[PDB]
Amino acid sequence: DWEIV
Amino acid sequence: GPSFKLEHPLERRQAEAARIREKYPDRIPVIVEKAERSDIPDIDKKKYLVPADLTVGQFVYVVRKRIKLSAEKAIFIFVKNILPPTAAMMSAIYEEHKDEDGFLYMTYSGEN
């Protein structure tokens, strides 16, 4: 679960 | 405090790094965790995929949006206890400081 900046 | 390496052995970390860097080739995977000695609140999210040319300062703002602090309270983000330059690109920080596992580890604190 990665925050796409 | 820093927990990602506590909670996952090298093999799982490297595998996740490889997975994500293949899926997003131009992004830098960053792990942001609370500095060991700080009582600042938790941030909403630990794992960030950042564009390579995002600046450090733009990233600090990104992180500050994911925490609840009264307006007078400070935040600081460190890489291996160095305060990086807000004008630097995340790509340069990654080159200097990336971990063996492929991630860039940063900490945040209410104290500098």
Author numbering:
A (entry chain C): 1 to 5
B (entry chain B): 3 to 114
Q: What's the publication's text?
A:
The P. infestans RXLR-type effector PexRD54 (PITG_09316) perturbs host-selective autophagy for the benefit of the pathogen via interaction with ATG8CL. It was shown that PexRD54 specifically interacts with a member of the ATG8 family of proteins from potato, ATG8CL, in vitro and in planta. In plant cells, PexRD54 activates selective autophagy by increasing the number of ATG8CL-containing autophagosomes and stabilizing ATG8CL.
Therefore, to visualize the interaction between PexRD54 and ATG8CL, we determined the crystal structure of ATG8CL in complex with a PexRD54 C-terminal pentapeptide. This pentapeptide includes the AIM motif, with residues Asp-377–Trp-378–Glu-379–Ile-380–Val-381. To produce crystals of ATG8CL + pentapeptide, we used an ATG8CL construct lacking four N-terminal residues and five C-terminal residues. The structure of ATG8CL contains two domains, an N-terminal helical domain (α1 and α2) and a C-terminal domain that adopts a β-grasp (ubiquitin-like) fold of four β-strands (β1–β4) flanked by two helices (α3 and α4). The side chain of PexRD54 Trp-378 is contained within a hydrophobic pocket formed at the interface between the β-grasp and N-terminal helical domains of ATG8CL, whereas the side chain of PexRD54 Val-381 binds a distinct hydrophobic pocket between β2 and an adjacent helix on the C-terminal domain of ATG8CL. In addition to hydrophobic interactions, the indole nitrogen of Trp-378 forms a hydrogen bond with the side chain of ATG8CL Glu-18. The side chain of PexRD54 Glu-379 makes hydrogen bonds and ionic interactions with the side chains of ATG8CL Lys-47 and ATG8CL Arg-68.
